[PDB]
Design a protein around this ligand. Structure first.
Ligand SMILES: c1cnc2ncccc2c1
Length: 165
């Protein structure tokens, strides 16, 4: 199971780890992807998860978009987890760098409540442009299910833990 996670709250845990490597090791029921509305997994967590699936995640995502159209910012869809997890929950947090509404971050985290346990990144953090300290705060105040956060950056991980209220 999940190991080496620091407990933040009753249900939120955090570790300095590459979510791809965490996924290959744990093979959780659900890995969360930091998706965009088009499921175009180019960079950040999405690009890394997709590259780990040998592009099978992108092929599956393009078929999903061809059938269903784009997701909403704050929305999600459940697709295969391929070699990483049983399922991948593609969650669209607002991309501040693309001018999207930061108020949608709480709606994005509400998607996690449909799954008992998840391996996840901090939504809207990294190349999405939001303040990761704010994202962790919204996570612990929104998610009620068991969330194991993987923070790739060591220096950001230290900053998140040492500043956690
Ligand atoms: C490999 C490469 N880029 C990453 N970016 C964000 C999170 C995890 C990653 C792993």
């Amino acid at each position: 199971s999940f190991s080496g996670y620091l407990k933040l709250t009753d249900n939120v845990y955090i570790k300095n780890a590459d979510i791809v490597e965490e996924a290959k090791k744990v093979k959780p029921t659900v890995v969360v992807n930091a998706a965009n509305v088009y499921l175009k997994h180019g960079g950040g967590v999405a690009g890394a998860l997709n590259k780990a699936t040998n592009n099978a995640m992108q092929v599956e995502s393009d078929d999903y978009i061809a059938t269903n159209g784009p997701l909403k910012v704050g929305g999600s869809c459940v697709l295969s987890g391929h070699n990483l997890a049983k399922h991948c929950l593609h969650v669209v947090g607002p991309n501040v760098n693309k001018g999207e509404d930061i108020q949608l971050l709480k709606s994005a985290y509400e998607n996690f409540n449909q799954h008992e346990v998840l391996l996840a990144p901090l939504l809207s953090a990294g190349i999405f442009g939001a303040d990761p300290i704010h994202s962790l705060r919204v996570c612990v105040d929104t998610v009620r299910t068991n969330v194991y956060l993987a923070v790739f950056d060591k220096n950001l991980y230290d900053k998140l833990v040492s500043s956690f209220l």
